[PDB]
């Protein structure tokens, strides 16, 4: 229910973090 | 591209899209063309764990579950990100051997946004299915109106009231919790609107009735008459219903 969008949340940090990085 | 469905996906997935655009300007300008993007493994395997869980999650609420729709097209949910991951490790290997790798840089746009996508899906699904039920209640009501038209006593007059009033609360409540969710104002008011619209003959569906009923009952002149409000009612009632089920059911 908002566990499911808990680790989606999570999944974008973890992009976010990833494209920040690059730089 | 288009303005996200809710504001709970909004909140997850926008700082996300915004920022993609944000590393597609930087490619296609120039100019990550300058360094080293450095060795990415661990970013990547961050975004892998984070991924495997997901599916982890998305792949335990599928073998759960009654809706045989969200069985169906959550799946290649877990594909397209699944497979998107694959592009981001590559990348990521790729730029390990040479940091002016530019398909690596193509690669990389292309996992992040296979994974936005892939995730507004999952998200989308959960969330048609979360409409879905609502509708089931609304059909739950509908239904019950159509009783209203053999309400014949007291007795049972209660008895229907009984019961109704509250299906009302349940419907009252999700429709409410859920118009505040929306992104557009148009739906949200147009629910609203036929929501308060249906609140209020209630009360009106219950003295239509009361007469019918009172007047069959003393045996006398224009049941006729109180058979036509109290049918009316139910038509306003049920065609403002259908209309919450229409907007529930919008872009």
């Given at each position: 229910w908002s566990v499911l969008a808990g680790h989606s949340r999570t999944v974008s940090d973890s992009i976010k973090k990833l494209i920040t990085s690059m730089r | 591209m288009p303005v996200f469905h809710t504001r709970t996906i909004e909140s997850i997935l926008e700082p996300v899209a915004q920022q993609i655009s944000h590393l597609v300007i930087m490619h296609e300008?120039?100019?990550?063309?300058?360094?080293?993007?450095?060795?990415?493994?661990?970013?990547?395997?961050?975004?892998?764990?984070?991924?495997s869980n997901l599916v982890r999650?998305?792949?335990?609420?599928?073998?759960?579950?009654?809706?045989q729709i969200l069985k169906r097209?959550?799946?290649?949910?877990?594909?397209?990100?699944?497979?998107?991951?694959?592009?981001?490790?590559?990348?990521?290997?790729?730029?390990?051997?040479?940091?002016?790798?530019?398909?690596?840089?193509?690669?990389?746009?292309?996992?992040?946004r296979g994974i936005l996508s892939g995730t507004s899906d999952l998200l989308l699904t959960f969330d048609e299915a979360?409409?879905?039920?609502?509708?089931?209640?609304?059909?739950?009501?509908?239904?019950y109106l159509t009783v209203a038209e053999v309400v014949e006593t007291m007795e049972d007059l209660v008895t229907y009231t009984k019961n109704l009033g509250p299906g009302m609360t349940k419907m009252a409540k999700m429709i409410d919790e859920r118009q505040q969710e929306l992104?557009?104002?148009?739906?949200?008011?147009?629910?609203?609107?036929?929501?308060?619209?249906?609140?209020?003959?209630?009360?009106?569906?219950?003295?239509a009735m009361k007469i019918f009923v009172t007047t069959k009952n003393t045996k006398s002149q224009g049941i006729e008459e109180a058979l036509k409000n109290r049918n009316f009612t139910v038509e306003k009632m049920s065609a403002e219903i259908n209309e919450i089920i229409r907007v529930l059911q919008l872009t």
């Open positions: - | 300008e120039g100019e990550v063309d300058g360094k080293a993007i450095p060795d990415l493994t661990a970013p990547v395997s961050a975004v892998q764990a984070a991924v999650v998305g792949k335990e609420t599928v073998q759960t579950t009654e809706d097209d959550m799946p290649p949910a877990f594909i397209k990100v699944e497979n998107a991951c694959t592009k981001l490790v590559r990348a990521a290997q790729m730029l390990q051997a040479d940091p002016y790798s530019v398909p690596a840089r193509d690669y990389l746009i292309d996992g992040s979360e409409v879905r039920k609502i509708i089931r209640v609304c059909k739950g009501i509908l239904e992104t557009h104002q148009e739906h949200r008011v147009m629910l609203v609107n036929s929501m308060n619209t249906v609140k209020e003959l209630l009360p009106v569906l219950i003295s």
